[PDB]
Nucleic acid binder design. Structure first.
Ligand SMILES: [Mg+2]
Ligand SMILES: [Mg+2]
Ligand SMILES: [Mg+2]
Ligand SMILES: [Mg+2]
Ligand SMILES: [Mg+2]
Lengths: 245, 217, 100, 166
RNA sequence: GAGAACAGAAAUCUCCAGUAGAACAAAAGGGUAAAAGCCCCCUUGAUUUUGAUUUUCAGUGUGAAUACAAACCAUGAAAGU
RNA sequence: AAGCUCGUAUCAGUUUUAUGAGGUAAAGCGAAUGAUUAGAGGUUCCGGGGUCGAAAUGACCUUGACCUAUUCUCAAACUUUAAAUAUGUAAGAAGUCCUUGUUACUUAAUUGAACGUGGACAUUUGAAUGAAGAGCUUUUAGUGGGCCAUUUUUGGUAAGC
């Protein structure tokens, strides 16, 4: 009981990618001018403040970089300590998402089976099978929240065999169609997959690409099992490695 | 489809084998292929399914499989008396870009070395898979003659952008009951491969490579 | 291991088939080869289009997005071993057979 | 009567910084030099300055026992002109050297192979060294029967008529 | 530690010392050297039928574990497991 | 509370004798473990990630890798030895010995294993002291806010914390 203002930033994910981006941006703007101390935690950290003015301007800075929700709490000593609980939306970039049906229909009649493509003050999803994006806001997320299907630990490697195209691009992304194989049975089997993806302008035949393999997956998700069977694909490709040396 | 009392295919095979060599005794080009068109499926909206359903019965004896490999499998290919390739030969093949698009046409297939196939992905560049000639690997202790027999008798159903998949399922040579077994195996493989196990298959036709007017299926 | 880093891929030969087979009668007045290469590169070297001129006032060989955008820009704007054969000959001239 | 200081092993090894055709080349060289097939060896760990990852082959070696050992040793001493330098002698009583440009070993001048180098290492012992190599009732060598540096230097100075400088 | 061309902290080979200072998926503790570690060979006992017992304990349930029985198998020259 | 089957049992908030288990006090570390703390550079010995990027001779970032040529220093989560106090079992008749019956288990076997028939062994029947009778069953009440003292302790400078 010696500060009078506490700000507690949390994100309930094992791999706190958005939180580490936020830490890089706080360190690269130096918004930690007037912090008394910093307490570590398992899922975030607590900043301390002598008066609540630096705390509310920290809230003002955080409300425009990351999709968050904040709540205020009042303490008594017998003059009043204040506590600001901030939660980051627990969906990071390049994560695989199944959307609620009403939200997917109201957000442009997009598919439910999407990929998180950009995180800003809001969050952005994109359909990899047909290039089409959508913007979800923090308040409409936190009105009724959901979780992600797969995080970036079960990304398996793929060896690109052949490329085609369809001509359609939406800027920075050429929607093409590529045939691919797994590097655990490329020299074993004759098993090839055909994926209509947005890694067409960036990929050429013979290299390695990360993706989700849905055909080997035990998913316990009511949003997933409420889908259809034929309209969910086998592989969702996300990113190319491309190590120079 | 779910199988439909195959005596109609039996009479169709008999009429096809009386069309070939009993009304036109042409030169030896026996290939009684089965063409199958599927119905009620969108190519973009549904998954592009594929498999291979290799029946040991053979109909295309004259095939070209330029075995690309190392030195030991090069000696094994020279023993098995088939067209092989070398490492410097494949390096020159990847050097001359126009030579690959021609060697993909002078050959009929390919069979690679489980020691050099994880490079044909990039060294031997694209359009080999677009011509559907990605090489199948062969190990350091498996039989090369048996692998060539399997790569000459291995049939593969792949879903393209068109719903008209045709396969060299038989020859017009002989063996009516073995041909009936081959037609049953191909129909079973297609019906199990499609999404609805019976409903999607519409068109079945037999043709003994001669534009014969005997399908009756 | 073996021949690995031959570099037959990574945008050199593969995924170069994103062409568009449309009506092909683009806006084309003067886009020929020598004046095109001169107006593209007067300070360095460059890489040219597949088959792009204005001889027939039709062009559809801009098989990429930036290719089609630059073609539409110049449409909307009006414009206009091998050393061995010498090395061994030098060495044979250096080996005069008289002086041995 | 038993203490004799004879030749136990002659080991020939060629280490290659690359992992290309050079290892198969040195393998054919060692199979042409010695009368036995050699063995290629995998790298222990990764370095990235030698350009080495683990589990891939680096070097070739072969071991020779019998009269071919002292034949190869006489050829190597003929290359080394019968001179050692008071190093190249272990305290345990083994000795070796290394040979650049292996064309002077009966190897011809073929350009399909080219030029290599080699390391020769000679392991010495006495009779009765089975006691440390058997399975049942293993023991040791007593501290009068072991081969030492001065014993090897004097014995294989007086035979082969060589010289040990410094 | 002592030796071997390039070889230079550190690449491959040879000998001596080495009670474990290594390894055994993950926390920590225990256990292990002709092995429980490392390298090979063969396999599916991660099978069937049901009782009894230990821990938490009301001596209820859930989880986990122990020792037999009646079958069918694996491995090994075998005892065995 | 109601009793029931019996009549000095074989039982005990205890000692003795015999025989197990423990790792705290004390010793000792210097016999192997001997520590947090503020600790200077050595970049292609590592590099964790984060942002862009029609992608790789690919730019932009900062905790740290590793203390490098620093030791005395000591432990409730360190070990060689190891009390006192407290703790398990035994001190016989449901026992011991001799002989030979059963079995579909076990042995190479006429061997064993378990349970027996017949016979021998009471002044002490196998240490001490005590024993208000011993054993068994059914049924039901209230209670399920506790507090204080000596000693041994944990967290908080510390408290009637
Ligand atoms: Mg239980
Ligand atoms: Mg003490
Ligand atoms: Mg009796
Ligand atoms: Mg009660
Ligand atoms: Mg009460």
């Amino acid at each position: 009981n010696t500060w009078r203002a506490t700000v507690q930033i949390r994100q309930k994910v094992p791999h706190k990618r958005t939180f580490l981006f936020l830490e890089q941006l706080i360190l690269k703007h130096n918004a930690h001018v007037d912090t008394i101390s910093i307490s570590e935690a398992k899922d975030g950290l607590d900043f301390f403040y002598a008066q609540k003015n630096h705390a509310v301007k920290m809230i003002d800075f955080l409300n425009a970089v990351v999709p968050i929700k904040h709540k205020k709490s009042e303490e008594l000593i017998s003059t009043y300590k204040f506590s600001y609980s901030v939660e980051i939306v627990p969906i990071c970039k390049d994560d695989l998402v199944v959307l609620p049906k009403k939200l997917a229909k109201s957000m442009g009649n997009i598919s439910q089976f999407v990929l998180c493509s950009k995180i800003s003050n809001t969050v952005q999803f994109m359909d990899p099978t047909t290039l089409q994006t959508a913007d979800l806001s923090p308040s409409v997320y936190w009105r009724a929240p959901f979780n992600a299907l797969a995080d970036v630990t079960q990304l398996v490697e793929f060896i690109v065999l052949d490329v085609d195209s369809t001509g359609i691009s939406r800027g920075n992304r050429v929607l093409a169609d590529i045939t691919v194989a797994r590097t655990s049975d490329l020299g074993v089997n004759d098993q090839v997959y055909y994926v209509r993806s947005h890694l067409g302008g960036i990929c050429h035949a013979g290299d390695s690409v990360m993706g989700y393999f849905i055909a080997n997956s035990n998913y316990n998700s009511d949003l997933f099992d409420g889908l259809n069977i034929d309209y969910v694909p086998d592989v969702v490709l996300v990113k190319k490695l491309y190590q120079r040396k | 489809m779910s199988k439909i009392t195959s005596s109609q295919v039996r009479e169709h095979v008999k009429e096809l084998l009386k069309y070939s060599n009993e009304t036109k005794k042409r030169n030896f080009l026996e290939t009684v292929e089965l063409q199958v068109g599927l119905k009620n499926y969108d190519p973009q909206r549904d998954k592009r399914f594929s498999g291979s359903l290799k029946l040991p019965n053979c109909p295309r004896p004259n095939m070209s499989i330029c075995i690309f490999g190392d030195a030991f499998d090069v000696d094994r290919a020279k023993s098995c008396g088939v067209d092989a390739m070398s490492v410097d030969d494949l390096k020159k093949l990847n050097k001359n870009k126009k030579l690959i698009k021609k060697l993909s046409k002078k050959y009929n297939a390919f069979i690679a070395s489980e020691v050099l196939i994880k490079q044909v992905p990039r060294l031997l560049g694209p359009q080999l898979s677009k011509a559907g000639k990605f090489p199948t690997p062969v190990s350091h202790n498996d039989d090369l003659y048996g692998k060539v027999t399997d790569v000459r008798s291995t049939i593969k159903f792949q879903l393209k952008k068109v719903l008209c998949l045709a396969v060299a399922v038989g020859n017009v040579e002989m063996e009516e009951d073995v041909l009936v077994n081959q037609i049953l195996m191909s129909v079973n493989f297609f019906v199990s491969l499609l999404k609805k196990n019976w409903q999607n298959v519409g068109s079945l036709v037999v043709k003994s490579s001669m534009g014969p007017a005997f399908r009756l299926y | 291991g073996f021949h690995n880093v031959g570099n037959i891929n990574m945008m050199a030969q593969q995924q170069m088939q994103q062409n568009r087979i449309k009506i092909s009668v683009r806006n084309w007045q003067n886009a020929t080869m020598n004046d095109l290469i001169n107006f593209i590169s007067r300070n360095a070297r460059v890489a040219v289009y597949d088959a792009h001129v204005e001889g027939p006032l039709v062009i559809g060989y801009v098989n990429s997005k930036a290719e089609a955008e630059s073609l539409m820009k110049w449409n909307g704007v009006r414009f206009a071993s091998d050393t061995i054969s010498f090395l061994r000959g030098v060495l044979l001239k250096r080996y005069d057979p008289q002086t041995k | 009567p038993m203490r004799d200081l004879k030749i136990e092993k002659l080991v020939l090894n060629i280490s290659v910084g690359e992992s290309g055709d050079r290892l198969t080349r040195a393998s054919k060289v060692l199979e042409q030099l010695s009368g036995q097939t050699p063995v290629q060896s995998k790298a222990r760990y990764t370095v990235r300055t030698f350009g080495i990852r683990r589990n891939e082959k680096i070097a070739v070696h072969v071991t020779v026992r019998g009269p071919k050992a002292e034949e190869i040793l006489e050829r190597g001493l003929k290359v080394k002109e019968y001179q050692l330098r008071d190093r190249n002698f272990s305290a345990t009583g083994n000795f070796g050297f290394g040979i650049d440009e292996h064309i002077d070993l009966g190897i011809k001048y073929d350009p399909s192979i080219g030029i290599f180098g080699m390391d020769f290492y000679v392991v010495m012992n006495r009779p009765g060294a089975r006691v440390t190599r058997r399975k049942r009732c293993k023991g040791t060598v007593g501290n009068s029967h072991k081969t030492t540096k001065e014993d090897t230097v004097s014995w294989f100075k007086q035979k082969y008529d060589a010289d040990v400088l410094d």
